[model samples]
Target: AQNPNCNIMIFHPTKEEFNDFDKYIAYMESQGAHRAGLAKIIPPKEWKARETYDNISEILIATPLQQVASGRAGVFTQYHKKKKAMTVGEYRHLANSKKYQTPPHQNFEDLERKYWKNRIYNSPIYGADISGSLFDENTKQWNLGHLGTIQDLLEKECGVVIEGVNTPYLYFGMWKTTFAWHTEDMDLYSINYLHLGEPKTWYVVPPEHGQRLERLARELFPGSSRGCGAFLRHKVALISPTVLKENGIPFNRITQEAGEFMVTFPYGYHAGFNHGFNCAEAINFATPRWIDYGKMASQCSCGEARVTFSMDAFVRILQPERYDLWKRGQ
Candidate 1:
């Protein structure tokens, strides 16, 4: 948790600022840039969020019992952190339960409150940063070693231009669906990649329904939203983790392909999760080191802006999206 893994830099400039891609690269490199952190700063003009997108959203499924069984020994020996010694069935059952079961109201609040309490105590688990997936009860089902392969892809293929680069920052939080949501991080994009199982996601929350649901869930779920993974930027965008939870009912069935991954561009409102599925995936919220164009402020279709935030904020893209994109087997 103390370690910083995926290192990236965000650059914000309006389209007109650098019409030539090569010139942009030369200019960025001249600035001592080491990587091509994804541009979370698409001009407000090009962004086209639909009321809903069938192509942009799809559930990803990864690893099955049979596939897992083939690698069970390695997973257990290599991945499973030794805890209480239990039989394979017992262990798998626990893994399933951890991934599938809904947190009781008490358990959810306990997590929510405990998180803040930790903050109050100055031992906060969550910082102004991103970390790996926090699979409290569901840690056993997936393989992090293989997931590291995805991280390697980010550095080699994505042009992070930095050593020890992480992309689309992967972190854990409690969240819910059936309503609108947002995150505190500003000017970022998310490419939530699936490692262990599948998760469903909804990206565009129609403002009409979004505000109404946000209000309703706020009065009830409170901080449960933060517990669920979410990415947001003030003034421009908001994105939610794939999640399952309602006024009082917990929804599951959202998931990602074993090796699949998904990407969300800047500033648009996105929300998603395993509706009732116990899904395990590394979330990557790529926050830019620079500010995107100030469309809202400029009234112009596009314009330049500068940075007010630090790349110290967690953001990176896991390298394994293509593999994480396959459908789940029953």
Candidate 2:
């Protein structure tokens, strides 16, 4: 699946298109994220970035999502339940103000000097990894995407455990909720399926120039070394497209809408923010091509080498039949 491609490709497929899951997986393997008719799969409701007064009662009754305190744009690790758990209505109230607005600023220098400074107090928006807590076995079996399906088959056949790598983590986002620039571990691929709510804008740098971007990132904010983890120390710098373009780094701007899927390939640096309230699920998966990169990425904070390392135990069993096993039983 290696190529010179850097564009985000979108596909419109009806139910008939995926009657053959194998064919669907092949497309995903080659093209990255294959967005389809998720609008039909999910319920038809009024899902928007901002809340409507009409849904106030419903929002008040909905479960309170978690929020952590910190400067608005960067990372935070400590938290406590809000005094009375912030309802969706309450969150909307907070987000409707300019306090939540993320205005466009110029250049990386201004972003580093002013944007990421730690403010004394700020309201925390709710977000978390909901893979294990929210999703059950039955839900996981659903055909959200073929990334998980292929991994399951390979793990079952090869007797290699690819555990958390394929599990989907949920993100419930509101205005200014940001993810910093980082690449997938072991050059693994990732897919983010927007289940509901407002669209999230993504800033993507191709894998070929990922290191150059990282080097520049570290130069601007020296604290963002590898030990900071994949989320860029939880404080994503506001590097605008003009900054990247002026430096001649190729990148793509993607606005992932409801029912759309955003695919991130190996070593691609990506970061973005939700325009409003939204929910999405993302997971990582590997193809046969990821083996070599996996070995090297293991040493980085983003990777868990053990997942790929376990393949050795099944090497002898899969060696002779590798060719036949490559594309079967998807």
Candidate 3:
């Protein structure tokens, strides 16, 4: 069975709404966008669409040469992989190459067949950790820099450093580069901004179907799930949205263009592929309203210990008066 892409909400916020991150999210949540699990915001045109980077031109980092095989409606991972050290320009040349753009098979197949055949490893630059690597020091003016909900509050209160959540990562895309289906850490909300290049195609399942999606992934990859309990968190898994729709799991698709911000809500499963060579930034965040869902991250179903930031630690933050001064000395 074939399923068409579902439409999601697009926000054209005023400058005030754009500046106030929490207020805008509250408005989105109020509009029932939470039901769909994701929304898109096109930044005000008056603002600069992208920021400059330091080594994007001359640097040739090792990027995964994803091995994908012919399959239904698209290509799937062949399990074996190779790495190519190429500049962004070299990747861009290959992304638009006719060989990479050629259509794959046009038949439908079993969900599990699709599973073992495909894996996803997206392209990301570790700019947030290194100063002056991706975005320059003057990027304080960037909207994403000040999106300030969880990032701001934590910086002011907890003084904990969680890379990729508070610190944004840069992604350089190609024709078939894709991210696997997954949720944010601690079930926190996340925002993605497209700096430039082409549109990115995203598929997201609503919070209600979160169980169905996981169950389906488990059902498809019994070996991985049984071995690790949280195998999907590994991010190598991929299931066609067609299979999902046929199994009663509802999902929406979005073509995220340059200058647009895509927001993913807590517990919602999201995955996507890029249209071509593009630059984007993604970071995890939360608000006071997220506390209820934040509690959900406490345990992994299979009982595995996570090395990422801990919600419990953040919650245990003591009062300033209790210590005569908080981490910020406030």
TM-score of every prediction relative to native: 0.30, 0.60, 0.72
**Residue-wise C-alpha lDDT for candidate 2, range 1-330, written one tens digit per residue:** 433454555555555553553465466546543221011122123322223325432233133343344433333322334334455556656656677644455643343333235321444465545442222234322234334443464565555654332456666666556565666644556767676676677878766677677666665555545444333423335465656776676777657777665667666677765766677777666555544444444122232212333333223224434323322311
Question: Which portions of model 2 miss their true places by more than 4 Å?
Answer: 1-5, 19-22, 28-124, 132-142, 145-166, 226-238, 298-330
Using TM-score as the yardstick, the better of models 1 and 3 is 3
- The C-alpha stretches of model 1 lying farther than 4 A from their native spots are 1-95, 98-180, 206-257, 275-330
Task: For model 3, state the Cα shift of residue 48 in Å.
Answer: 1.5
Best by TM-score: 3
**Whole-structure CA lDDT of model 2:** 0.50
lDDT (CA) per prediction: 0.29, 0.50, 0.61
Number of the predicted model whose lDDT against the real structure is largest: 3
Candidate 1 matches the true fold with a TM-score of 0.30
